[PDB]
């Protein structure tokens, strides 16, 4: 099982997990806000706007050339994802405050070229080239668009090469790792939510397998049964947060990431770098 397409309910599940994690959480109000956005993502995915279909010849060529069928840079430039942004904005009539109201308005008012420039920046990790307040909304629109496209492939089309650091469906970096019930490890795409098998004893950026280290931080919840452990690598000074479903089967790559930002800081002070984007949260900015 090299590949896992996400559930058609991925966004509802993500929202529910966020609500579950938010209870008694220092950033619970924020996490509950993101849950609302994830609920919107599910409603959109269940009721797509009119979309230009994927060119079946272009799919054929990209597959013939060993490229991801939903290669993000190409598709983000073509603009066929744009009706998702329109739908998300129209489906968000009740923002929490004036600043989010202002973020949505900038997105509503921006024309195609502007929206595309921001989307290219976000998907390439150039956070200084879009406004931080727009990130969650633009990111959420792009995630729905790419998951919709993913769920409509065309099985065989997604590459199943055996030690890819980048998503075989869209070419984006993972947001997190997922260790599924000896016990197989998957990378989880930051964009399309494709999960793909990646050898368990290897750094997710540089491909060194040399003795990596595994780091968990207390939660009341003991460390031998930890759901979160960061994989750390001294050769590239990278870390990747990974969730172990053996200890909580409801663990979600996006929701458990947003609920464990304390570990990121513990690592970012220990001299470790994160190269796994979360498209709903700027660093940022
Ligand atoms: Fe992907
Ligand atoms: Fe490394």
d(CA 7, CA 151): 9
d(CA 216, CA 219): 9
Ligand (nearest to CA of 211): 2
Greatest CA separation for the chain: 55
CB 115 within 8 A of CB 107: yes
Can you name the residues that pair with 196 across neighbouring β-strands?
3, 187
d(CA 75, CA 65): 16
Measured in whole angstroms, the distance separating CA 102 from the mean position of its chain's CA atoms is: 24
Which DSSP category does 172 fall into? Answer: P
Other beta carbons less than 10 A from residue 48's beta carbon: 14
Ligand (nearest to CA of 204): 2
Q: How far is the CA of 241 from the centre of ligand 2 (A)?
A: 13
Number of H helices, E strands in the chain: 10, 8
Tell me the backbone φ, ψ of residue 261, rounded to 5 degrees.
-65, -20
Q: Provide the strand spans (E) within the chain.
A: 3-4, 174-180, 184-189, 195-197, 213-215, 228-233, 238-244, 273-274
Here the CATH number for the domain that contains residue 95 is: 3.90.1670.10
Range of the domain at 113: 1-285
Q: How far is the CA of 81 from the centre of ligand 1 (A)?
A: 15
Ligand (nearest to CA of 168): 1
Q: How far is the CA of 121 from the centre of ligand 2 (A)?
A: 25
Method used to solve the structure: X-ray
Closest CA to 171 of 65, 66, 68: 68
Ligand (nearest to CA of 240): 2
Can you name the residues that pair with 242 across neighbouring β-strands?
177, 229
Other beta carbons less than 10 A from residue 60's beta carbon: 12
d(CA 252, CA 14): 6
Q: What's the total number of domains in the chain?
A: 1
Residue located via tokens 């998957």 = 186
Please list, in sequence order, all residues whose beta carbon lies within 8 angstroms of the beta carbon of residue 182, skipping any fewer than 6 positions away. none
Q: How far is the CA of 191 from the centre of ligand 2 (A)?
A: 22
Q: For residue 164, give both structure tokens.
A: 């890819």
Q: For residue 152, give both structure tokens.
A: 């409509």
Q: How far is the CA of 23 from the centre of ligand 1 (A)?
A: 30
Ligand (nearest to CA of 68): 1
- What spatial distance separates the first Cα and last Cα of the chain, rounded to whole Å? 39
CB 72 within 8 A of CB 191: yes
State the burial class of residue 214 (Cβ atoms within 10 Å of its Cβ: 0-12, 13-18, 19+): exposed
């Amino acid at each position: 099982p090299h590949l896992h397409q996400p559930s058609r309910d991925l966004f509802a599940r993500r929202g529910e997990r966020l609500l579950q994690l938010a209870e008694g959480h220092p950033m619970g109000d924020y996490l509950r806000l993101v849950a609302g956005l994830c609920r919107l993502q599910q409603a959109l995915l269940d009721n797509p706007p009119a979309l230009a279909p994927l060119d079946p010849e272009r799919l054929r060529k990209s597959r013939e050339h060993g490229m991801p069928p939903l290669a993000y840079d190409l598709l983000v430039r073509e603009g066929a994802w744009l009706p998702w942004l329109d739908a998300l904005l129209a489906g968000y009539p009740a923002p929490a405050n004036a600043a989010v109201g202002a973020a949505l308005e900038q997105l509503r008012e921006a024309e195609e070229g502007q929206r595309k420039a921001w989307a290219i920046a976000l998907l390439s990790g150039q956070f200084d080239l879009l406004p931080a307040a727009l990130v969650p909304f633009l990111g959420a629109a792009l995630q729905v668009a790419w998951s919709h496209w993913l769920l409509g492939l065309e099985e065989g089309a997604v590459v199943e090469t055996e030690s890819r650091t980048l998503c075989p469906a869209c070419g984006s970096p993972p947001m997190a790792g997922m260790i599924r019930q000896t016990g197989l490890r998957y990378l989880s795409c930051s964009l399309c939510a494709c999960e793909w098998h990646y050898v368990r004893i290897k750094c997710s950026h540089c491909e060194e397998s040399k003795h990596l280290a595994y780091l968990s931080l207390e939660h009341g919840q003991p460390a031998e049964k930890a759901v979160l452990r960061a994989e750390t690598c001294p050769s590239c000074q990278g870390y990747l947060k990974q969730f172990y479903l053996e200890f909580d089967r409801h663990a979600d790559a996006l929701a458990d990431d947003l609920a464990s930002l304390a570990l990121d800081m513990r690592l970012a002070e220990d001299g470790y770098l994160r190269r796994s984007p979360n498209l709903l949260l700027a660093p940022g900015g």
